[PDB]
Point group: C4
Chain length 479, copies 4
């Protein structure tokens, strides 16, 4: 072009040649490199306290299983059930016994709670609740049973005695009515003070676990799976100043620098997008003032650089992350999962920002941009393969999921089928069927035809096209 060709060309040139010609020093360049190191150490420094929370929550859960389940070892979370009446009674009584004699037996430190919520009365702590049918008279031989699903909640409340008994039982009389039994649910919460947090030196981590011991009998199959689930609940409990002076200032000073580096890069990107709008206002130099080529103004949408849009997306996650971290570390906030996903995806997307920095010798972008050539065909190919995929996925879910371990949900089917097309647990899937060889042989004989067809189709007949697309894009890009 005549007038603005210099500015047109200068926008798309590489940073070295752009810096060699005109403008200012590459301050934008360094802050991106600094961002990568700043956010990754932030990510890890968050990670130290992150896993400290999860290990504490989980190990407490593991500890609760070895107190309030009679005969549970570390192994068989599933396949831990009652098969006998007195044995289930013993399971239920063991939980209550160990709840009553908790501070005697336990290694940690678990304070009880008085009943504020709905499963508890004003005073109670442990509260085992029989979900059982309102109407019921089951007897397989003779007629008339008369059942309707109305769950009556027989809750038996009990709270423990403290170490000094004031001078100023019940659950031993418990009967379940096993023919009418939907389940038994032992609810109790335990407050604790997490003393693991003295590596980063934030002692105020006063947890409250919510133990749900569930004797689940939704099957009525003579087998009542016994399980123990915990919900945490975290806030402070009065202890300021003991050995906390530096870390409160340092970690505060670190994340504000992350915020500074991310905001400074976000501003410099905002300036880069600000340039984007002006070019659109040129309208391809009004067709060079010649009305030439008959331009359709669709490529004008694809014109603007996406790497900046990705960079901004990653920034938002970083800066949203750091405010979540300042909150969760030094204030009333409590959700590590969200902050971890945020800072993690932020670092994932930031580290791939180096690819943007890699445009030297005009040879990296031959290897990188083959995906930009392929993606059109890969998208179109992926549809038809996914179409077949969902067929096997929906088929194997309902047909094989009843009889087998790996297909119990569409998630697991979509995991298993995906692990199949690369080849892991490919024999184990067929090995699940060896139990079904002498029971529902049509399901066994179907599953062979299913698994052979599925992986023969995708590992050979379909993957090869996907390799041929990506290698075929590499064949075109190198010319």
């Amino acid at each position: 072009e005549e007038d603005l060709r210099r500015r047109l060309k200068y926008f798309f040139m590489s940073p070295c040649d752009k810096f060699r010609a005109k403008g200012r020093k590459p301050c934008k360049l360094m802050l991106q490199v600094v961002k990568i190191l700043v956010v990754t150490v932030q990510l890890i420094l968050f990670g130290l306290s992150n896993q400290l929370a999860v290990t504490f929550r989980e190990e407490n859960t593991i500890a609760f299983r070895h107190l309030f389940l009679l005969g549970y070892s570390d192994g068989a979370d599933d396949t831990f059930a009652a098969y006998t009446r007195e044995q289930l009674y013993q399971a239920i009584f063991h939980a209550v016994d160990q709840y009553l004699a908790l501070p005697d037996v336990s290694l940690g430190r678990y304070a009880y709670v008085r009943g504020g919520g709905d499963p508890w009365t004003n005073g109670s702590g442990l509260a085992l609740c029989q979900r059982y049918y309102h109407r019921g008279h089951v007897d397989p031989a003779n007629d008339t049973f008369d059942i309707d699903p109305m769950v009556v909640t027989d809750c038996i409340q009990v709270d423990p005695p403290e170490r000094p008994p004031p001078p100023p039982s019940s659950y031993k009389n418990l009967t379940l009515k096993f023919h009418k039994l939907v389940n038994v649910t032992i609810h109790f919460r335990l407050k604790t003070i997490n003393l693991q947090s003295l590596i980063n030196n934030e002692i105020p981590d006063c947890y409250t676990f919510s133990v749900l011991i569930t004797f689940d009998n939704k099957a009525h199959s003579g087998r009542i799976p016994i399980s123990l689930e915990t919900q945490a609940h975290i806030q402070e409990c009065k202890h300021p100043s003991v050995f906390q002076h530096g870390d409160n200032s340092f970690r505060l000073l670190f994340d504000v620098v992350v915020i500074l580096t991310c905001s400074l890069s976000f501003l410099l990107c905002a300036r880069s997008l600000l340039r984007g709008f002006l070019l659109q206002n040129e309208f391809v130099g009004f067709m060079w003032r010649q009305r030439g080529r008959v331009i359709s103004l669709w490529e004008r949408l694809e014109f603007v650089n996406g790497w900046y849009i990705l960079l901004v997306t990653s920034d938002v996650l970083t800066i949203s992350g750091t405010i979540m971290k300042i909150g969760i570390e030094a204030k009333n906030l409590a959700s590590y999962d969200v902050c971890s996903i945020l800072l993690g995806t932020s670092t994932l997307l930031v580290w791939v920002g180096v690819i943007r920095y890699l445009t030297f010798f005009h040879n990296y972008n031959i290897l990188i941009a083959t995906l930009r050539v392929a993606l059109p065909s890969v998208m179109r190919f992926c549809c038809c393969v996914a179409v077949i995929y969902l067929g096997y996925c929906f088929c194997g879910w309902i047909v094989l999921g009843p009889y087998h371990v790996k297909f119990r949900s569409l998630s697991m089917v979509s995991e298993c089928l995906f692990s199949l097309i690369n080849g892991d647990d490919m024999f184990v899937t067929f090995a699940a069927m060896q139990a079904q060889q002498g029971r529902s042989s049509l399901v066994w004989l179907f599953s062979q035809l299913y698994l052979y067809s599925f992986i023969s189709l995708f590992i050979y007949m379909v993957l090869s096209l996907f390799i041929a697309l990506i290698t075929g894009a590499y064949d075109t890009i190198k010319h």
Copy 2:
């Protein structure tokens, strides 16, 4: 052609251009898309009740193992055997004890049965039966044992007492003759009322399990594998109307709509095949009335589009499915396995029907129809590879199957060999041999040569040709 070129061409054109030119609105197009959603939700809605049946059957089996096997935990179904006389006695007596004291101990609800069948006399319920040799005098040292395989069936009948004993034992005297023992088989059936079926609200699921506890001693190897197998048997047992009004109408109204959608599509396909027969009656315009080209009438067989034939095949499975579902849900039918395979294969084949819908921009069919180009060569290549495959399959079955876990049947060999050529449990196969390194070292040394050769031949020397065929078809199709 002159006259029917328009109709000739109009048949093979895509639905968009076909609709743009002449004919009617695309009602056929929408009903195929509706079919996909209608049949998949049908499939899943069947799936809810499907796994409810399998979980109930299986968990009851698991419950029976923990009652009627002395020392069985969830783990080691195989490798659960008696090794000692009194221990086997205890195993046999434990089953009978737990049968006698079943409604006391059990968590579920199991009603007994009176002896109608052949292993039971008129009154009996539990019936342990010694299969033992008629003639036998085995004694490895001294001469003359005189054995012939005539199994004498010493059955000891016993039925339990109900909770009210009328005012108006034996099996404790049991002796097996272990040198002559073929096996001991404890048969008993238990009736139950499946109360798990109140999610879909069909309470009438009155099962009758047939427990076969088998002390299998066909080996005479001082180890008698103890196992427990169950056959279900399902029908109703008198309870109409309690909370069943809507679901009886809704699920009935859903599958008839599936039948309507499948039949309407089947009719519209019948109209599409009806057009097929007319072209055949043209006979390639009697060679354009010129006798030109010398047409052989083989391509005339390949002329007609198969996607309709696949669509009809999938319809049949859907409509046969839904009538099986209406039957099994509402009215005395009982085979979930068949209906699941039917509706599942129906949905598998229906979902791949979207590929037929995908013919836009003339680019999907470049990726899809490479298989139609390749299949000629892939079929011809597959024969020679399968020929070699069966060699290793028949060889490894008889040679390695005695000594190892993965080759105990041609099915498992064909699974293992197939998992090998992609690479799963490839080390575990060699790891099975490490026991055989100090016993039958020729079998070990053979198996190395077998497994190396087999996977070196197929993963490298043979797979590469299959990749080259499919990629080679992709090389030809894109021109």
Copy 3:
């Protein structure tokens, strides 16, 4: 050529065109197809009795472990050891106790033996033998221990009482000297009558197992691995005629037909090789009597057809197999392992004989003979890769084998490294190192560099060349 061109060309033409032109009916063709079915059913019919022998031997071994090892369950063959003196004593005494009270407790039928061999005196049956040092005075604190490796064999003989005690102990006084102890070895043999062999109806299978219970203390590591090994020993023991009339004639009549079919094919191949020698006697028509081309007489070695040589090799295995089978089934022979390898390799090599039959449309041999084109380059490439392979194999054996499970022998290294280059147990190898992260961190840090380098080199940088060779041969063969 002039005279013998017809015979020259007629030799190499396909069987269809060869039969169309001149000669006789294709009797050679059918007998090869018949051979495949005849030898495979032979193979399987041998296989029925083959695994019957192995299952009996192994299950008896499993039974011996559950009698003569105190606390052994099915699981942990390795990692079953004594750690305490009295516990080892109990282990040793349990074996002897259970040997003394064998026919009381056992389920099978085990007759004892009187001492003919070298570990037994004239009369003894069980004989526990302490291998311990002649000189020894070990005491880590103080000086002078004076040890030389001369194993003194303190054998304590004991044989059991029969059910009638004649009117006309010791091992309870046993002391091991654990500081001087090399091991304790309990030897005893048990005769049995294998009654599993009444499916094929050959009752005379009178086994004699040789139980070696070894308390191996070659380590002196405060842990003495307890293991039990068995050698079988099989011949008849006087019982002719009870229900044996047909099977003795049928199986005899089957293998002689296999011998007939193999010998007839071997003769017809001998006739095909007989033609081979005549052509050599033509000497390429003495250069057409023109001295043309300057022929070097190396291609004359490759001239003669190899498929016949393979066919003869496979025949020899079949016919050597069948005579081994006639022997082992109906005579004093006893080695299933050799016959299984023989008939198995025979069937493996026979089934690949169909490839020879597949030369139709001149298109199978384009897919098959690409290996004949590639093998020159594949051999040359394989050397350099194997050269690197043995480097990692010898390195990982001595360096990683001490610390890890998968590298304990060059066999296992060569299995593991080979399973690595396709990708199975690739994470488990790295997972073995996680124990060594806090002990010998240089070995851990070496093993990372080893396993990364090894599989990065072979899965990517080396396999790709092997794929490129085989695909590159396919690129050349199709022209």
Copy 4:
């Protein structure tokens, strides 16, 4: 060139043609082949004694776990913890009991030690030490706990009585203060005489293990992982001459020959590098005395052959190895790990020296040197893929490592992610998430998106380029 073209060309010619023309006999050639056999048998002969040390150390550790841990079986090293106060007490007392009654119970031979070090007083042997907080008053309900991390070390000393008690307890009074407990650490060392070393006949291996039984309670999670770690410590203890005459001379005579062969090859390589410097002194024949190509003197760096440089690097490891072996075998040195890595990498690098020998028919180097062509592009491609890799690696470490087994450290993440891109434990990673489906569903839903994206990106979209680079180099090299 005119004058030195002969010497220029003669340097780069193959050994056969170089030997055919001028110079001396190929003594260099044979000694390289001899080196391969000499160093590999050295490597293995070292390996015999190498694993003898590791097996002894490890099996002793295994033995210590079965003495000084109450209820530990071989299985669950992790997931072996105390959950109850008295149970932990019993765990602690069991170690001390078994320490006091060690020579009674044990199978080996463990002499005690008197307290020289810092955890022991002048006389003590066993010394259990409570790491507990100086200040502490934790009580989740009520206010004011006042904790500072100052670990007070309450060590309770106790040494055992010898077999003669002289005519001229405490730890039973032990109390932990479990609310203030950081951990309990039982330290004791055991001297032993390794009698396993009489295969190579070096009896003087007098070990001293340092048992650290750690009741680690850094979590305060009501679960105190119990573990047992051992550090060895090896030197001689007075026993010269019993049956040691030959092996002392033979193994000495073997490694000096290795040193001779390596030094002779190192000298001959020094002569090969000596030739390298002369060519540099020619300065590309002063531009052929024509000033022609304007040569940049970078290719001047590349001229000297790398395989020689690698050969000398591998020599250094061999000769450093052998002196370490002479030392560790026949002198006061003690580090098998370093010598194993040294001789192992030496043999790894020596065996790949055969590739250097393989330059015959000018066809091996077409297959080998494709990596020298590819490495430029492979390096450049590897950067961008590693950039993405570290994104997933740092992301999955902190996000998934808390909740899962395979991501607990960046090492394990880098192992797991690498095993993913070939496809092993690809389903097991997704199977770890099935616990997290009902707890932190955002982490579960993130991990799906993570694992799908990561392996879909690398197994398909990225690996294909790496295959295309290596196959693309093979495409260029064959022309």
